[PDB]
């Protein structure tokens, strides 16, 4: 009915009140059936609960569709009832709402992403795509993805929804445990940083914890995103009385927390499991009519995996090994889709100190596109670290970025208007950072030239509003080919003075040279002393790594 510009306008004017829990309400009415079912068997029950909330003062109610996706329904033998359940939900809800907002409610599937589960990004995406299509058709004023535990599943849900409609207001929520971590290891800052750049309208938290416990988790989230914020805590810490759990937090003890959330910039407040129409009634009284508080988010340069957030505030080692160039066994195995050999190179590199892993598939035309998408989705989970996607084909690049679990670093964009723009737009759509290689048509041969390229890149980046999402690679040339490493060291010092991170394809300095380890080591030390923030290097070179550690200790970058 209403588009996201309208919803955004309304939110800019006042904090809205969401509704409460439905499941626990249903049982109260003598129906222990699974929620989605009542949509068709006992619609009257569904309507009663919706009206109790509207009558309690809710500005927005959620459609009774939390488990209404094919993948989830198929687990109860309801997959063929997908169209009815959903269309009727948006209908029942809209009949209760009247002039109030109705948001389509979509929950997670309960299936972990491969390799923890067997599901690939593509299947999660089509799954969420179908449920959203219906909702949009039945006219919702927004869609909220509640209770998500994995960022890849949530990333698929939002990308799919946005694909279906670029006008629907979209909200993404993750649930965190007492340690402030989702099931697959994502903390609030990682969630905010990864999802803040996607085309969603608001972020938030619901479930797992009560109002008191979510507070500092909500605060961390609010500091890293400037989008609208939503929160729906459970009514206290669940406890068991006589058999099954109960949510003990009474209306007042819950409601007293609204002010603390309002001060943190909350835009929509509501309750999750255990919240009753009585809770909402009180929230309405306490919330009243308030204009949202303004926020200024913190900005940092970081890349991520589901469990790791790697900030460039210290020297980042990027493992170069998962690259078939000059490696017989690996090139051949990638050719046949050998996942395990890559998983092996990933773990060993991380064990040795790599904080990020570069991934390149040699002659792409020779590699299976499904293998790329599988490896890209897999490594962040089994190796635990973020990836530097070293891909040439713009087409395969889009496949890898769309299914990457987190915020990646994309490896290679030369200072070319056409190349840059294509890669920047893909990153703007799927998220990520970009390494910009300081070279154009041909390779530079001096500091001054690299400087012009730097300036030219800033021009284009400023033009595409992408200046804050890049790291510069001055371009190290082979020493055994008049590489002039001194001119690169100058470039590193210069770019560093400008406040930008830098990186270099280290091993390319000593390509074709005896004792390359020593030249690599020597160059790295010099580079770091000049401001080098990272390097794609061999973490299996013990001399280079220990000399690197010694170097950071000496420069007081660690101990």
mmCIF file of C-alpha atoms in Angstrom, residues 86 88 114 175 190 199 267 298 373 398 445 489 492 513:
data_model
loop_
_atom_site.group_PDB
_atom_site.id
_atom_site.type_symbol
_atom_site.label_atom_id
_atom_site.label_comp_id
_atom_site.label_asym_id
_atom_site.label_seq_id
_atom_site.Cartn_x
_atom_site.Cartn_y
_atom_site.Cartn_z
ATOM 1 C CA UNK A 86 0.464 -16.146 2.664
ATOM 2 C CA UNK A 88 -4.809 -15.089 3.501
ATOM 3 C CA UNK A 114 26.483 -25.244 3.172
ATOM 4 C CA UNK A 175 19.055 -12.535 17.039
ATOM 5 C CA UNK A 190 29.812 -7.043 11.857
ATOM 6 C CA UNK A 199 19.708 -1.659 -0.073
ATOM 7 C CA UNK A 267 12.661 3.977 15.471
ATOM 8 C CA UNK A 298 31.280 5.484 13.447
ATOM 9 C CA UNK A 373 29.982 -20.124 -5.826
ATOM 10 C CA UNK A 398 28.830 -10.932 -9.646
ATOM 11 C CA UNK A 445 57.664 3.403 -13.922
ATOM 12 C CA UNK A 489 58.012 2.486 -1.319
ATOM 13 C CA UNK A 492 53.224 3.643 -0.189
ATOM 14 C CA UNK A 513 64.986 -14.852 -8.353
#
